[PDB]
Amino acid sequence: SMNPPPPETSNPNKPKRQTNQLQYLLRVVLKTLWKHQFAWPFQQPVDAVKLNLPDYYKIIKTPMDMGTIKKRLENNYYWNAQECIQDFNTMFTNCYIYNKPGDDIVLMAEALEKLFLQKINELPTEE
Ligand SMILES: Cc1cc(-c2cc(CS(C)(=O)=O)cnc2Oc2ccc(F)cc2F)n2cn[nH]c(=O)c12
């Protein structure tokens, strides 16, 4: 029933990098998703108290959302792009474990996984 604290967006002793792929990720890919008409249920952490889904965090052991992700981008939290790219995979994957296919929240996810996959087919180069 209670919510856990949100995944860390800061960490002083994690190694950090502003790689150019990575700033594509925040500047194009995240904001390409961030403003899609279905981004809202994902712009922050799932709230099992307001939604009254107590079972959520018993099922979902590694929450991700775009809220923490955008922060992590703005926090140079990442070492490269694979890291951030798999913070998206878990965001979706959680939605496909917790819910069952056909659910409206599954729809929107799938919609966003595909645009996300569209915007991360082409990524800029290195310096
Ligand atoms: C990832 C995610 C986000 C929400 C959700 C979030 C918010 C706003 S917040 C973050 O403040 O809680 C409101 N409604 C929600 O549920 C919906 C339920 C029916 C829908 F057609 C559309 C939804 F967005 N979820 C509900 N169930 N399972 C999930 O995995 C899930």
Domain boundaries, the chain: 19-123
User: 21 C-alpha vs ligand 1 centroid, how far in Å?
Assistant: 30
User: 106 C-alpha vs ligand 1 centroid, how far in Å?
Assistant: 10
Euclidean distance between CA atoms 78 and 69, whole angstroms? 10
Euclidean distance between CA atoms 88 and 34, whole angstroms? 12
19-123 fold: Histone Acetyltransferase; Chain A (1.20.920)
Residues with CB under 6 A from ligand 1: 41-42, 44, 46-47, 50-51, 53, 95, 98-99, 104-105
State the method: X-ray
61 is written with which tokens?
A: 């052991």
What single DSSP character describes residue 40? G
Specify the resolution in Å: 2.5
Q: Can you say whether residue 67 is alpha, beta or left, with left for phi > 0 and alpha for psi between -120 and 50 degrees?
A: alpha
* Residue whose C-alpha is closest to residue 65's, from 114, 11, 6, 5: 6
